[PDB]
Structures are given as structure tokens and as C-alpha cells.
Write a protein that binds this ligand. Sequence first.
Ligand SMILES: CCC(C)(C)[C@@H]1CCc2[nH]nc(C(=O)NN)c2C1
Length: 294
Amino acid sequence: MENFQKVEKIGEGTYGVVYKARNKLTGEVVALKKIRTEGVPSTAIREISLLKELNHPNIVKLLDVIHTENKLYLVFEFLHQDLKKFMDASALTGIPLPLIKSYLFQLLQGLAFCHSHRVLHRDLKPQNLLINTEGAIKLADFGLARAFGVPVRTYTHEVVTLWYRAPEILLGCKYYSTAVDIWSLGCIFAEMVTRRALFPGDSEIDQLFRIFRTLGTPDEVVWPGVTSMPDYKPSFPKWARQDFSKVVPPLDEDGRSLLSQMLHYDPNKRISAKAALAHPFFQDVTKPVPHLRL
Ligand SMILES: CCC(C)(C)[C@@H]1CCc2[nH]nc(C(=O)NN)c2C1
């Protein structure tokens, strides 16, 4: 890519390095992801290229896809910073509730849009939610999981986080439904509110058992078919479910009700992004501007 002057390194993604770069012809400032090879299913190129038409205000725009010289470049819209950095920067005072509400509301709109188009993310995390100084938040890397899969480690060998992974994935389900993204967003919602990860697992079983310790070990009553999942073991310890009042204090009842529906074990019962947007929690939603120093 000689059509871009690198401005600086932005970060390291799951698949490749990312640079802030300026289009030397349009003057456009973008986030350029470079992914580094023999096989490579052409289906991946086709699949990713289709994402160029998945445009929404709450979805980071994919400007172009370029497969050349044993590399795959994804040119993305450039945004100020990610939610992880904002949360860490807001750790002492916490992100105000009105902004947390606004962010969740926008993220759900982004999800409703993509899910209405049968595109799921599958690996949502604070690191891929980007914000600007005007109060907007957008989801990034949407659809890359389907094309490439989610590896155990990134291209730099960094451990891919399990914290936001839905239970059906941990239990070995073959087919992922849009519910997996609602679960991840619910975990992110809890983290913004409490300023601590909800389920900070450090292995698949630690992740699964942390989920069980809070929400209760699932059974056929709350989740039909769970005992027949590939990685379910009758030997899982049986933990009692905790009250959300203890889980995400001091969130109000509307928020706890919404979070609880976002964390239902049964994917078929977990609230949809579309239904979540109509939840009473959003009755007084606004669009505050975040405090972004530099
Ligand atoms: C999804 C997580 C990665 C791959 C790093 C984003 C892709 C698109 C993108 N656009 N802006 C940024 C940024 O970091 N700005 N400070 C990123 C980074």
C-alpha cells in the first residue's frame, strides 16, 4: 500500500496490525488493518467484501478490501479511541449512567441492523467498540469472525479474551445465533456500570464456571437441551443463582431487568436487539457528549 502515508500505529487486532493512515489522494484519514499464507478460502474475500454494503451510523465503515501481495488490507473509518481506553480512563469516577445508557442504546441499534441482515459479530469486546467526541459509539470488526473464525491467540500470540463469550459457544454449540452478540453486549453493559469485568475467565472452564457461579448452573428447566450439548458434563458443580441486585449495583430495576434478559441462558429466549430497544430502560435515553481529553 503506497497510497497511504502511515501516521502512527493504532494497535494490534485479532488478525493483523492496524495503522492510522492518510489517503495520499483523497486526504482521507483512515484506520488501515493489514492481515498477513497459501490456502486462504476465497470465500473469505467474498464474505468480507460483502460487508462494504453493511452501512449504519453505529457500525464502523469498511471503506475497502484489498487482497494483494500475500496480504489483506481492510480500510476502516477512523475513530477517536476504543471503549476499553475510555472505561479505564473513567475508572475513578465511572462513566455517567446517561452516557452508559446512550452507548448501550446505540450499540443495540448497530446490532439490530446487522442481525436484520443476518450478519453477526461473534467476538464483541470493549476493544472493538469505538467512540468519537460527539457521543457516538460504533461496532468494529463486524463479520470478520465468520470469514476467519475466532482463534485461541491473535497474530501476535496474545490470548483472545473469553470474558464476553456466550455459554452456548463454551458448551460446544455448532451453530451460533444472533443471541451470542446480545450476551457479549450484556457483559459489556455490566462492566461499564460496575467498572469491573463481569466474568473475567482465564480459561474456558474458568469462564464457564464464573458464569455458573453468578447465574446458577443451567439445567433442563431454564435451558432445554443444555444437558445434550457437546461439552456439557453432568459433573459440573451445581451453583445457586445470585440476585442481580448483587451483580450490578447500583443499577436501577429497569437496567437490571434488561441486563437479566440479555443474559438468559437459553439463546432462543435471550432478548433480541430489536426487543431490547423497546425496553423501558430506554424511556429517558439521551445523547450526552463524553469528556475526552488529549
Ligand atoms: C476493532 C479493533 C481495531 C481493529 C483495532 C479497530 C479497527 C477500526 C478503527 N478505526 N479507528 C480506530 C482506532 O483505534 N482509533 N484510535 C480503529 C481500530
